[PDB]
């Protein structure tokens, strides 16, 4: 009961004691919260395997651009595997090809309702003003994740993250564009500033390479996946291991298993406190409500925080304070339900039933929707405690948290 979830190590008084109390016999029981991004290719274009992967852990499917009809088949195939169904949104990410001369894209971008763009070779804020200009007012609601992959981008990181919705640590290209021995510095720096900023961050490429042609990963690759979770990454990735390789689902299986283990061994006591000291005061009532709900979640070992949101914003500001409790986001928007897979700890649930006449009643119905999905999916049992986060009228106005026993 308290033996699980690394709770003994979560209550240590120092980072050092915490490490010494990590218990291989303590079982992850929380839902796995770090999103897996799988890169689509041959081994993963079967509507068959997409069913097998989406059960294995996939949350985002990545469309690398290195033909349009090829990727449009990919799209419709993923989508069919998603709608065959516990229903689990799955977002679609377009990873632009970008400039190339060993160290177009507007067509790929204007090109089907993608949820995310991993823009490539980003180096300045203007770059992001491009991709956002090109996406035009019709492409606004899409999420720009600037890939950082060269020295110039590392050094201008603050101006890039400023305008971006998120960041990718493009380790493949960085390990050539800068000494390989310096990559870990770039990674940890960037993950830390993104957690500080509350904007999702992605660790990527070669994380489970050997699994391209083996069923079991190296020791280094186990450690590498854990440590990206420990660093604070929102999403971890798979490239060849799912594009062009013999173990697409054993891969997604083991990224799920590893991240489930690493997430429990996060030292929240220190992470939360160091966000209390580094984060500026906020006067946004939604952020204020979120830090309140996370603190309450911890005080009672909440099973989940159930938040209502339309744009995904409320669930993001919960995610930035890293609750152990799962963030059960209930939304009528269907792109929101896919785009929040960029924020660690958010499980989306899409409410399709229509509005109700009294504002109060519509909210409860969505909230009980979350409780029943949660009950059925293993998050909630009865006599559990949860935190509930809603508004008073219909995203900006999200300013209420309630403590509720599950009945």
Query: Which of 47-55, 98-106, 113-121, 226-234 is the region at the interface with a second copy (rule: CB under 8 A)?
Result: 226-234
390 flagged as catalytic: no
Task: Pick the stretch among 13-21, 101-109, 323-331, 349-357 that binds a second copy (CB under 8 A).
Answer: 13-21
Pull the structure tokens for residue 112: 């089907």
Which of 218, 355, 361, 394 forms a contact with a second copy (CB under 8 A)? 218
Structure tokens at 127: 């770059």
Asked whether the beta carbons of 199 and 161 are under 8 A apart, the reply is: yes
Q: What are phi and psi of 170, to 5 degrees?
A: -80, 75
For a second copy (CB under 8 A), the number of binding residues is: 102
Q: Which of 74, 187, 319, 339 binds a second copy (CB under 8 A)?
A: 187
Output the six-digit token pair for 238: 């798979």
State the Cα–Cα distance between residues 115 and 127, nearest whole angstrom: 19
By the rule CB under 8 A, 79 interacts with a second copy: no
Q: Which residue has the tokens 């993923």?
A: 78
Show Cβ contacts of residue 163 under 8 Å, excluding neighbours closer than 6 positions.
125, 128, 129, 132
Choosing from 132, 147, 324, 366, the catalytic residue is 147
What part of residues 284-323 is at the interface with a second copy (CB under 8 A)? 284-285, 287-289, 291-293, 295-296, 298-301
- Tokens 């971008």 label which residue? 109
322 noted as active-site residue? no
Report how far Cα 17 is from the mean position of its chain's Cα atoms. Answer: 29
**Under rule CB under 8 A, which residues in 341-400 are in contact with a second copy?**
385, 387, 392, 399-400
Q: Do 331 and 351 contact (CB within 8 A), yes or no?
A: yes
Q: Is 218 a catalytic residue?
A: no
* Residue 56 near residue 253 (C-beta atoms within 8 A): yes
Active-site residue (options: 34, 39, 96, 205): 205
Contact call for residue 64 and a second copy (CB under 8 A):
no
Q: Are 123 and 153 in contact (CB under 8 A)?
A: yes
Among 62, 143, 253, 366, the one annotated catalytic: 62
CB 128 within 8 A of CB 164: yes
Nearest approach in angstroms of CB 119 to a second copy is 20
Q: Is residue 338 annotated as part of the catalytic site, yes or no?
A: no
Q: Is 192 in the site for a second copy (CB under 8 A)?
A: yes
Rounded Cα distance between 222 and 260, Å, is: 12
What residues from 126 to 165 belong to the interface with a second copy (CB under 8 A)?
Answer: 151, 154-155
Among 115, 221, 234, 263, binds a second copy (CB under 8 A): 221
Selected from 80, 152, 162, 274, the binder of a second copy by CB under 8 A is: 274
Query: Which of 125, 134, 196, 334 lies at the binding interface for a second copy (CB under 8 A)?
Result: 196
Q: State yes or no: residue 209 binds a second copy (CB under 8 A).
A: yes
Nearer to a second copy, 66 or 67 (CB): 66
Supply φ then ψ for residue 239, to 5 degrees.
-110, -100
| Active site (catalytic) residues | 62, 102, 147, 205
């Amino acid at each position: 009961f308290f033996q699980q979830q690394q709770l003994p190590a979560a209550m240590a008084d120092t980072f050092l004691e915490h490490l010494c109390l990590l218990d291989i016999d303590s079982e992850p029981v929380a839902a796995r919260s770090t999103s897996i991004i799988a890169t689509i290719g041959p081994a993963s274009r079967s509507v068959e395997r997409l069913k097998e992967m989406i059960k294995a852990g996939m949350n985002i499917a990545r469309l690398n651009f290195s033909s349009h009809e090829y990727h449009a088949e990919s799209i419709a195939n993923v989508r069919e595997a998603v709608e065959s169904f516990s229903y689990r949104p799955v977002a679609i990410a377009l990873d632009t090809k970008g400039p190339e001369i060993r160290t177009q894209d507007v067509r790929d971008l204007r090109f089907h309702g993608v949820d995310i763009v991993f823009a490539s070779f980003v180096r300045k804020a203007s770059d992001v003003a491009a991709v956002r200009a090109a996406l035009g007012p019709e492409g606004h609601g899409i999420k720009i994740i600037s890939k950082i992959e060269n020295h110039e981008g590392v050094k201008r990181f603050d101006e890039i993250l400023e305008v971006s919705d998120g960041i990718m640590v493009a380790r493949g290209d960085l390990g050539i564009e800068i000494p390989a021995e310096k990559v870990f510095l770039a990674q940890k720096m960037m993950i830390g500033r993104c957690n500080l900023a509350g904007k999702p961050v992605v660790c990527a490429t070669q994380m489970l390479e050997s699994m391209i042609t083996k069923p079991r990963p190296t020791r280094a690759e186990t450690s590498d996946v854990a440590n990206a979770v420990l660093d604070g990454a929102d999403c971890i990735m798979l490239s060849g291991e799912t594009a062009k390789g013999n173990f697409p689902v054993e891969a997604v299986k083991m990224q799920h298993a590893i991240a489930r283990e690493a997430e429990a061994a996060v030292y929240h006591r220190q992470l939360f406190e160091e966000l209390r000291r580094a984060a500026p005061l906020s006067r946004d009532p939604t952020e204020v409500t979120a830090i309140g709900a996370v603190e309450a979640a911890f005080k009672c070992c909440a099973a989940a925080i159930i938040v209502l949101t339309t744009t995904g914003r409320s669930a993001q500001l919960l995610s930035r304070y890293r609750p152990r409790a799962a963030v059960i986001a209930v939304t009528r928007s269907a792109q929101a339900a896919r785009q929040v897979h960029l924020c660690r700890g958010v499980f989306p649930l899409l409410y399709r039933e229509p509005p109700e006449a009294i504002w109060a009643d519509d909210v409860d119905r969505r909230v009980q929707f979350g409780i029943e999905s949660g009950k059925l999916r293993g998050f909630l049992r009865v006599g559990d405690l949860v935190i509930v986060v809603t508004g008073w009228r219909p995203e900006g106005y999200t300013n209420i948290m309630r403590v509720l026993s599950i009945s």
